[PDB]
Amino acid sequence: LFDENYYAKAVANIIGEVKDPIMYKWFSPDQIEDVDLQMGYQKTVKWDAFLNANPTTIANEVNTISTIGFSSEVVRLNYLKLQYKFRHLKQTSEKFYTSDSYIGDINNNLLPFAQAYKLASSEIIKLINHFVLTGTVSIQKDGKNQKRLLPNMYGLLNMPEQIKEEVASGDKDKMDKIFEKIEAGLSKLELGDEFSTPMMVIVDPATSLKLVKPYAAASSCEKWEDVLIQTIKAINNREDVYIETSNLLKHKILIYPLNSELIKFKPSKYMLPTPNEQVDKDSTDVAHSYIDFVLGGLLATRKTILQVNIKQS
Amino acid sequence: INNNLLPFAQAYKLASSEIIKLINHFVLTGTVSIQKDGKNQKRLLPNMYGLLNMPEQIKEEVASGDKDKMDKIFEKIEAGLSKLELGDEFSTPMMVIVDPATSLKLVKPYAAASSCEKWEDVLIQTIKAINNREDVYIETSNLLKHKILIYPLNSELIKFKPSKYMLPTPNEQVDKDSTDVAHSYIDFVLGGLLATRKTILQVNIKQS
Amino acid sequence: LFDENYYAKAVANIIGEVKDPIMYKWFSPDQIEDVDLQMGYQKTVKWDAFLNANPTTIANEVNTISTIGFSSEVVRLNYLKLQYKFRHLKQTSEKFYTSDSYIGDINNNLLPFAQAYKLASSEIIKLINHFVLTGTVSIQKDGKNQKRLLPNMYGLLNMPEQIKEEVASGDKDKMDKIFEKIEAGLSKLELGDEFSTPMMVIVDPATSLKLVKPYAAASSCEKWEDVLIQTIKAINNREDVYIETSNLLKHKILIYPLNSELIKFKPSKYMLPTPNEQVDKDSTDVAHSYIDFVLGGLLATRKTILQVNIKQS
Amino acid sequence: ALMKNPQQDSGLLSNSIDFRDQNLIFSNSGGVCTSSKDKIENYPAKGYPYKRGVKLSFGDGTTELEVEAGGGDDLYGVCSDIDEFSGMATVIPITNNFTGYLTLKKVNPGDKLNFNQHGELEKVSVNAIALSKAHKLTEDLFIVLASVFGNRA
Amino acid sequence: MKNPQQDSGLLSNSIDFRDQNLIFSNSGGVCTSSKDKIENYPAKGYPYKRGVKLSFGDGTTELEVEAGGGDDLYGVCSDIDEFSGMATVIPITNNFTGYLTLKKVNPGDKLNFNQHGELEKVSVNAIALSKAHKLTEDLFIVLASVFGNRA
Amino acid sequence: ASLLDSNFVPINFTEFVQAISNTYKQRRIQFYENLKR
Amino acid sequence: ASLLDSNFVPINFTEFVQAISNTYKQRRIQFYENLKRHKR
Amino acid sequence: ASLLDSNFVPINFTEFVQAISNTYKQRRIQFYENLKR
């Protein structure tokens, strides 16, 4: 196949230069399991039990006894397949643009297929990481004109039925108020029997800068970051706490455990960018190629994620 | 199932079956149409005829009042048989194509009612009288409607010279795109029926 | 099990004395397929193709070609579970009711378990045969107060999308008119490529008495039955034409091929009566037992059944 | 919309840590207290009478009798469960008492409740005594724990 | 719904070949060229077999297509994917020939899209190639060839 | 696994029901074998 | 030069089409060989 | 069946895509092994 198709050989020879996604740090090795799908859904069933009333006292003779009820919940995860198209130079036409240093027309912004694929794959991986973090797909800084996505497709930040805290605009710079909100959210967290697990916190650069200020009169050898780590260690059975900074987040703090029993990422095995066989050819030197990627597959238990939003308005 | 998409083999098989059905309909009726009323027909080139629309042939019409009168239908068939002009090619097998309703009318006993004698047997004897006591085959086709078609099976009088590519043949061109849906093409050739004049009897039973 | 449960041993020893259902005569050996389901449904998928427009002539240059459409149909068969309860005498109490001629109580109509189960199973088999023939479940001779069954549960007589003819009330005694209606229905019948198959006709005794009349002044050589057999042989490629009489039908004629490709009966493997393990036992000599049976499973193609009803008003 | 089991799937797994106030759901079929000597009858369902009082409805005569949501002097029983595949409603007759959650018209413990024309309980013939206050599950869906003790003026 | 969700009770008879295309499940056009431009848009409601118009929200979400016509006509919806909620649109610049929903008409009549994306007799948008075919009590289809917008 | 087989001993009611079904199937097969129209 | 022969390995689409035509002709010949018309 | 393996000779584009997926999975495993936290 490589002898006949040049594009496949170039993709195979340049796939190594593509960097690994940064979203891998946000999850433990056991928290990610690949699934075989491109567009569809995966469903699971969970069984719960509940008490209908107070117990019945067994005295003398009795026939009417209190009942215990059962319920089922079906959880569905949806997947979506998306495509991008990019223009590049033809393999036969490369020799007429192979300058001494650079290869490709600077004036016309035309590139060889290998470099174009590398850059496009990097951009698509950035978009995928942004989707996995925020739960939205957009290419605007303001966050408008978002792509309408299928239901049951959520990220860590927009996950519903989780603990949500809001720091007011007046208390935007008050790390004490921010920590009060974080403490309230941590108290409202419900880990159950899975408490003994490592915890992960993701913060914006501004929050990271505010963390290193001395804990408040100013304390000695005690900082807000250390206080937060101790507070989280109080609830996670003194397990490891990993703090990360992400430029994608903005005035948002995300706290969640690293246990597969609570949060699990089951992405499609074709989620990462993959080239398409179809190549648009013409009589000119410009050709077109396509890249496919799959989105969706984050599953979380209810009331296990703390999301703190600092209103900056 | 939701979007009505099939594998290439199954899609090609179904398309070929439908095309062969259309080709058989064309070979019989001499027209190409997808409506059951025989309207909005495709305009074809001249000198393209079928076994039912061939010009300069013998045509008989059973009236509305005699729609169920097998005796009147047989009278019209006898008139057409007498008007036939087989000539020196008379010693040849004969073929009759009939609609199911008229076939059910034929299978009745010949009419008191003659014992061990049917209308079909009487018709076979009548045709054997003119074909020099040769085989007379009778077939039923749902394509015909209130129509009876009688013609010899002699190559000298009627000859079918179809193309060697008349039956469906796949095309090398396959439309492809970045999606999972592709397109394929099937070709077929129509035309090629020759018949001498005044050698086919076409009986139409006018219903109502 | 036979050394502990007396009722199971009685069922085993009495099961061989129950008559086989008469519905077997209405189907070929290969037209019946047992399925493993008590209550629920089974789905099948069929694909079909159609032409969208007139053919396009290939002349000079053209890229707009006529298309061929495809369509899928899903057919669902429903299987329903039903139960009866019957009263009998306890095993240990039989000796106090044994007599010289019979075992039981004539005055109170109490029977041993074996006899009671045999009679109940016979009645249930009669009901099942009636359901398979007519498509309705009722106990009244008139046929009213029918059991509201599930959709996609049909019989030979009430099967929709089939050829239906109605002989007028004034022509109920006119065999010529009846046979004209039969001719019209047979002409409207559509067997397709499966025409070379045996045919089956089911008639009522009055219809049979009218058939055995001489064909019509009146021919003394052949009968109306012979004329009908020849007519059906004209359409089944001169195959066998079996004729049966059923007391269940009343002034109705059923004609259908014995081909699995067109009509198939896929009954449940538990359709026939089966005893239950729940036996009601009290301090008296009367006990209760339960019998289960499953209904549904007739699949037919469109326009392959002729149903002639002779209006008797 | 009103079916016992929601057709819409749930996006997330539930948190099975708490054990309090986890039974006031519409899927809770049956009764809070049930005896082994209770009489229950399955009947063909006309409409959706689940968790509502039912009345006997007769057709022309071709088909058997069925049960439809209703109350008043025509009340025949209380629908405690439903099987959608067979369209079969399980009814406890008015001759048998029942204790469970029933639909309430869109109320304090000790109030007297009677069934209306739509098979919904409403404050006052007296048919039941409210054992709790109205619990809202939807903008129009209000349930209430009631004890039915038949007919009495 | 393009595909009848309710299951059929009987197997169909695949013997005839005539008048087997006048169905609502038929997607696309009777004559399709390999050089036709096809787009996919988010679906607002059910615009299948109806003219679509571009609708912009408050800016938080991207534009979508809704059943409509008049001066706001943007294209014709010929297919829909229900799982993804995606409507296939042929732009009004591209010409289309196929079966479209008709307002509840003879060949040669000039038809224009109404506010609900239904064709109606008279700027003209298409020419009726056949008569109205009734599929349901209120569902009527008609074969029409769209050649853009012309007064 | 049929009631016709004397050596067969049903351990439980499930085996008894399966044997009943198998016996019914065998009876139908035998009826079709011995049927002459 | 027919699709019936397993040893036949077409080289191009023209040979494939010729093989299809030959196979159709052979099928017609076989059908006429096996045909048994009813003469009554 | 990974792009890292030099012995891999993709017969078809389907095998090439499967090898791409396997290579991505192996890269994820390698990154998690190398991570020290």
Please report, for residues A274, B77, B105, B204, the alpha-carbon distance to residue B65 in angstroms, rounded to integers and kept in the order given.
75, 16, 16, 13
Q: Which helix (H) or strand (E) holds C57?
A: none
Q: Which tokens sit at E111?
A: 């038809």
Do the beta carbons of residue A209 and residue A243 sit within 8 Å? no
* The two structure tokens encoding residue G22: 């030959």
What 3-state class would DSSP assign to H19? helix
**How near does any CA of chain C get to the CA of B106, in Å?**
9
Strands B201-205 and B58-62, sheet pairing: parallel
Point out which residues pair with C87 in neighbouring strands: C288
Other C-beta atoms lying within 10 Å of the C-beta of residue D1: 8
Cα A55 to Cα C73, D33, E24, E132: the distances in Å are 53, 10, 58, 68
Q: Measured between alpha carbons, how far is A162 from A159 in angstroms, rounded to an integer?
A: 7
DSSP C269-292: TT-S-EE-S--B--SSSEEEEEEE
- Chain A hits for B178, CB-CB cut-off 8 Å, are 83, 85, 276, 278, 290
Q: Chain H contact for A243, CB < 8 A?
A: no
Tokens 């006709």 map to which residue?
Answer: C201
- Residue B149 near residue B200, CB atoms below 8 Å: yes
**Helix (H) or strand (E) segment spanning residue D40:** none
E109 Cβ partners below 8 Å, 6+ apart? E121, E122, E127, E128
d(CA E107, CA C198): 48
How far, in Å, CA of D112 to CA of D109, rounded?
A: 9
Q: Using a CB–CB cutoff of 8 Å, tell me whether C150 touches chain B.
A: no
Question: Residue C5's closest CA among C91, C104, C86?
Answer: C91
Q: Which residues contact G12 (CB under 8 A, 6 or more apart)?
A: none
Q: Which of C15, C270, C277 sits opposite F3 (nearest CB)?
A: C15
List subunits contacting chain B, requiring 3 or more Cβ pairs under 8 Å.
Answer: A, C, E, G
Task: Judge: G37–B137 Cβ closer than 8 Å, yes or no.
Answer: yes
What is the C-alpha separation between C159 and C154, in angstroms, rounded? 6
Give phi and psi for F20, each to the nearest 5: -60, -45
- Whole-number Å distance between alpha carbons of D71 and A6: 78
* Alpha-carbon span A185 to A165, nearest angstrom: 6
Token pair belonging to A63:
């026939």
Give all strands (DSSP E) within chain C, no chain letters. 40-51, 64-66, 68-89, 163-167, 199-203, 241-245, 252-257, 263-265, 274-275, 286-295, 298-300, 306-310
CB B182 within 8 A of CB B176: yes
Q: Is G21 on the interface with B (CB under 8 A)?
A: yes
C chain contacts of residue B41, beta-carbon cutoff 8 Å:
54
Angle subtended by helix axes B70-83 and B119-130, to nearest 10: 10
CA E3 vs CA B23, C73, D30, E29: distances in Å? 30, 9, 38, 17
User: Rounded to the nearest 5°, which phi and psi values hold at C249?
Assistant: -70, 150
Helices (H) and strands (E) in chain B, counts: 4, 9
What is the Cα–Cα distance from B172 to A137, expressed in whole angstroms?
Answer: 41
Say what angle helices A113-134 and A6-14 make with each other, to 10 degrees. 60
DSSP strands (E only) in chain H = none
Amino acid letter, residue B34: I
Cα–Cα dist C291/A286, whole Å: 77
Beta bridge partners of A45: A74
- Judge contact between A79 and A297, C-beta under 8 A: yes
Resolution in A, one decimal? 2.7
Asked whether the beta carbons of residue A146 and residue E84 sit closer than 8 angstroms, the reply is no
How many CB atoms sit inside 10 A of residue A173's CB?
12
Distance in Å, alpha carbon of B144 to nearest chain C alpha carbon: 12
Alpha-carbon gap, residue B183 to F31, rounded angstroms: 53
Nearest alpha carbon to residue B126 among B91, B81, B93, B60 = B81
CA nearest B84: which of B115, B60, B108? B60
CB A251 within 8 A of CB A308: no
Contact H24/A at CB under 8 A: yes
List Cβ neighbours of D123 (8 Å cut-off, separation of 6 or more). Answer: D107, D111, D112, D113
Q: Which of E2, E13, E26 to mutate to test the interface with C (most CBs of C within 10 A)?
A: E13
Q: What is the dihedral of CA A19, A24, A29, A35, to 10 degrees?
A: -90
3-class DSSP state of C66: strand
The kind and range of the H/E element at B109 are none
Q: How far apart are CA E30 and CA B200, in angstroms?
A: 37
Contacts of B124 in chain G (CB under 8 A): 40
* Dihedral sign from CA coordinates of E5, E6, E11, E17: negative
Within an 8 Å CB–CB cutoff, is residue C150 touching chain E? no
C37 contact D CB<8A = no
Say if G31 is an interface residue toward chain B (CB within 8 Å). Answer: no
Tokens for C188, please give them. 């409207």
In the numeric block, which tokens belong to residue B146? 């209130």
DSSP state string for C137-153:
---SSS--SB--PPSS-
Nearest beta carbon to residue B116 from set C58, C74, C221:
C221
Q: What are the backbone angles phi and psi of residue A228, rounded to the nearest 5°?
A: -65, -40
Is B147 in contact with B206 (CB distance < 8 Å)?
A: no
Q: Which residues, in sequence order, are bridge partners of residue E141? A: E101, E133
Shortest distance between the Cα of E93 and any Cα of chain B, in A, equals: 21
Angle A276-A279-A280 (CA atoms, 0-180°, nearest 5)?
Answer: 140
- Please name the amino acid found at residue A111: L
| Alpha-carbon distances, residue C73 vs A7, B10, C33, E14, F18 (angstroms) | 42, 15, 22, 12, 34
Question: Going by DSSP bridges, is the β-strand pair C68-89/C298-300 parallel, antiparallel, or unpaired?
Answer: unpaired
Q: Say which residue the tokens 């240059």 belong to.
A: C61
- E105's enclosing H/E stretch is none
* Subunits in contact with chain F (3 or more CB pairs closer than 8 Å): C
Tokens standing for residue A299: 């599953």
Inter-chain touch E9–C46, beta carbons under 8 Å: no
Cβ–Cβ contact C64 with B under 8 A: no
Identify whether the C-beta of residue C38 lies closer than 8 Å to the C-beta of residue C79: yes
* Beta carbons within 8 Å of A88's beta carbon, 6+ residues apart: A110, A111, A112, A113, A116, A117, A286, A287, A288, A289
CA–CA dist D51, D48 (Å, integer): 9
Task: For the beta carbon of residue C311, count every other beta carbon within 10 angstroms.
Answer: 12
Coil, helix or strand at residue E79? strand
In the Cβ-directed half-sphere of D108, how many Cα atoms lie within 13 Å?
Answer: 0
CB A286 within 8 A of CB A87: yes
Q: Rounded to an integer, what is the distance from CA D65 to the centroid of its chain? A: 20
Alpha carbons within 13 angstroms on the beta-carbon side of residue C131 total 28
Closest Cα of chain D to A36: distance in Å? 20
Assess whether chains B and G touch, using the rule of 3 or more C-beta pairs within 8 angstroms.
yes
Tokens of G35: 């045909």
State yes or no: chains A and H have 3 or more CB pairs below 8 A: yes
The CA distance from C17 to E38, in Å, is 71
Cα A34 from Cα G31, distance rounded (Å):
55
Tokens 């594009």 correspond to what residue?
A7
- What tokens were used for D122? 């409403």
Backbone φ, ψ for residue A291 (5° rounding):
-130, 135
CB pairs under 8 A between C and D: 23
Mutation target for B interface from G14, G21, G27: give the one with most B CBs within 10 A: G21
Q: Which has the closest alpha carbon to E99: E49, E42, E52, E33?
A: E49
A132 neighbourhood in chain H, CB within 8 Å:
none
Expt. technique: cryo-EM
Residue H13: which of A1, A269, A270 has the nearest Cβ?
A1
CA atoms within 13 A on the CB side of B15: 23
Q: Structure tokens of B191?
A: 């035309």
Beta bridge partners of D79: D91
3-class secondary structure, D153: coil
* Upper half-sphere CA count for residue C52 (Cβ side, 13 Å): 21
Q: With beta carbons under 8 A apart, name residues in chain C contacting E28.
A: 67, 69
Q: Is A290 on the interface with B (CB under 8 A)?
A: yes
Structure tokens at A126: 């950035």
Best residue in A56, A64, A149 for a mutation probing chain D (most D CBs within 10 Å): A64
Record the tokens describing residue F14, joined without a space: 């499930």
CB B127 within 8 A of CB B77: no
Contact yes or no for B142 and E15 at CB 8 A: yes
Count contacts between C and E (CB, < 8 Å): 87
Name which of C20, C270, C5 is nearest C113 in CA terms.
C5
On chain A, the residues whose CB falls within 8 A of the CB of B176 are: 278
G25 part of contact set with chain B, CB < 8 Å: yes
- Beta bridge partner(s), residue C204: none
CB E33 within 8 A of CB C178: no
How far are the Cα atoms of C28, E67, E92, E103 from residue E89, in angstroms, in the given order? Answer: 52, 11, 9, 20
Burial of E73 (0-12, 13-18, 19+ CB in 10 A): buried
Return the residue in E2, E3, E8, E10 with the most chain C beta carbons within 10 A, the one to mutate for interface testing. E10
Mention every residue, 6+ apart, whose C-beta is less than 8 A from residue C44.
C74, C75, C77, C299, E11
- CA R_g for chain H: 12
Please report where in the chains the tokens 């079929």 appear, as a residue: D29
Distance CA A142, CA C257 (A): 71
Which chain A residues contact residue D13 at CB under 8 A? Answer: 46, 73, 75, 299-302
Sort strands E86-91 and E39-44 into parallel, antiparallel or unpaired: antiparallel
Question: Most H CBs within 10 Å: which of A243, A277, A291, as the mutation test of the H interface?
Answer: A277
